[PDB]
DNA sequence: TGTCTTCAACTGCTTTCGCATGAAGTACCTCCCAACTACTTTTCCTCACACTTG
């Protein structure tokens, strides 16, 4: 996705999906294409939450 | 038989963000339309000739 939302992005499309290629969703306009929070700063890591089971 | 080299044709981009305010193509064709004039249309009106008379 960080290659089609570049330049010749039909290139990259063709290339890509040629491969079968999985996206791993990594890049962070990758990810932006999915509606995913940002890996980057405060996506970089989860927050859970310490419950009391009694 | 096998590998190598240059040139020219082809690909993709080269500031961002908003107001305005959107408009305008047009050949080929025309049937519709507006026109001027004349012609035509529907109801109505009023007189008239012949045979016969004496």
Same mark, same amino acid.
């Given at each position: 996705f960080?290659?089609? #939302?570049?330049?010749?992005?039909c290139?990259?499309?063709?290339? /890509? ?9 990594? #890049?962070? #306009? /990758?990810?932006?294409?999915? %509606?995913?929070?940002?890996?980057? %700063?405060? %996506?970089?890591?989860?927050?859970? /939450?310490?419950?009391?089971? /009694?």
């Amino acid at each position: 996705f960080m290659k089609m #939302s570049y330049e010749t992005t039909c290139q990259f499309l063709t290339k /890509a999906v040629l491969d079968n290629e999985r996206e791993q969703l990594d #890049s962070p #306009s /990758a990810r932006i294409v999915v %509606g995913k929070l940002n890996n980057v %700063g405060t %996506g970089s890591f989860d927050v859970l /939450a310490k419950v009391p089971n /009694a």
